[PDB]
């Protein structure tokens, strides 16, 4: 007599009113910003929500410069951002080469979420 | 008489009004940030709530320079920001070279986010 | 006469309102900032809620400079950031070269979040 | 030479959003109440006005009397009035007789809202 | 020479969201009440506003009284009232003569709001 | 030579958000109450605003009294009230007679608001 099985239940996340990422096996670059949650209840009243608030009657201008040579200005540049490579650069003679200078190469990945085995070697009757 | 099983039962998370993410495995770069969670119940009043509040009536600006030369200007550059790679330079003359520089490269992965083995060797009859 | 088994049962975090990530096996690099929580419960009056407030009337401004030469002005620069390689420099010559400088290069990774093992090695009836 | 004259300018009077009654000589009964006056600005919020707010879940009833003999039951009654002569009377015999219980009776006016004269007597050429 | 003038200006009062009577030369009987005069500014809030505010759950009922005789209940009567001459009596009999209980009898009035003269008694040419 | 005049300005009161009575010469009974005034800036809050407030969950009512005998009950009467005569008894009999019990009776008068004269007896030329 030879009696065998396998069995297996699973059931995904619940969610109410939010943000979820259940399971992540072998991941590379993950970026999550600003991804808010919030109730609220006003009543005989004035609720203001906001993560970044930039009150700036003057914020990053440039002035009054008459009769001028060679300048080089950049406000606010690379705001709130991601991967900027050799980007926005204020020069007068670029000049780049090589082998160098990478971003995110050459990834080699064996990644299973989930594994279940059942290994039976010889009953024989 | 040879009799064997294997069995497994799985349920994901539960979030009310959350952010969450249950069980990640093998990650590199993780990068969260203002995922902020708030109740407010307001009443007869003024609720203000941010986690940045920059009030100002002269930010990164310039003043007047008249009759100036070679200037090199940079506010409020790479505010806020991630992997800004060798970006946003104020210069005049540029050479870049090399087997340098590198950023995140050459990986190798192996990652099992769960394993269930039962192994058997025999029973014979 | 020759009985086996497995069994496993699992589930997920609760989450109630919050910030919450069960379990990383085998994390690089984690940057989480900001992740806030809270309630309000205002009656008759003015609640404020913020981490960073910069009441700053003047900030990171520049003067007035008639007549100047070879300036080299960088206000609030890399403000809240993360991962600024080599970036925004306020020069006039710039040389790189070589094999370095070198962010975050080359890893291995072997790595399990569960593992379950059961072994039989004979029962021969 | 004889030279004379007379001169009378009048003007009402000026009411804005209000109750006004100027000038009422010789008057008998007057009974003014409840004539209100308001300005209101809401804004986020809610705002009740009212002189006379009752809130009363059980006023004025009765309760229960089974097998009752020569009631006399007389609620709220009079509420907010004004000349209630030998009136609502919670009897089983009644008389009245008489030159009495008189209201109001029998008046005598000579009454002038305003006046001018002008009395010349003799100037003779 | 005989030479002579009247002359006499009047103008009204000025109301702005009130209550206002002028004057009131030879009056008898007056009554004002709740008359009321009111500026509400609300934000973000609940105001209430009132002269009478009687919360009576149970105001002025009566029980439970079974098998009874020769009652005489009356509650909440005359309330908020004027002139209420031998009225809303509980009795059984009631007699009433003569030549009394008057109200407001047999009045005479002579009575000027304003007088102006001008008296001239020979000037004779 | 015989000159003369007689001359007046009269302007009524100013009244801005507010009860007011000028001059009245030769009143009789006068009866005012709760003619209020009232600014309110609420900002943020809440405000209640009252004269009489009267809270009482049980006011005046009766109990329970089974099988009871010639009852006189008369609870809150004449509440807030004027002029109540020989009213709302509790009795079984009444007998009233007479000459008597008068309310403002047999009045005379004479009464000026303002008065101005301008005697001249005898210029004869």
């Given at each position: 007599r030879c009696?065998?099985?396998?069995?297996?239940?699973?059931?995904?996340?619940?969610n109410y009113r939010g943000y979820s990422l259940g399971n992540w096996v072998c991941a590379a670059k993950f970026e999550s910003n600003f991804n808010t949650q919030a109730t609220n209840r006003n009543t005989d009243g004035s609720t203001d929500y906001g993560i970044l608030q930039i009150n700036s009657r003057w914020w990053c201008n440039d002035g009054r410069t008459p009769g001028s040579r060679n300048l080089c200005n950049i406000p606010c540049s690379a705001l709130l951002s991601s991967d900027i490579t050799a980007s926005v650069n204020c020069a007068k003679k670029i000049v780049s080469d090589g082998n160098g200078m990478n971003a995110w190469v050459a990834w080699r990945n064996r990644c299973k979420g989930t594994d279940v085995q059942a290994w039976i070697r010889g009953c024989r009757l």
């Open positions: 009696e065998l099985a396998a069995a297996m239940k699973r059931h995904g996340l619940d």
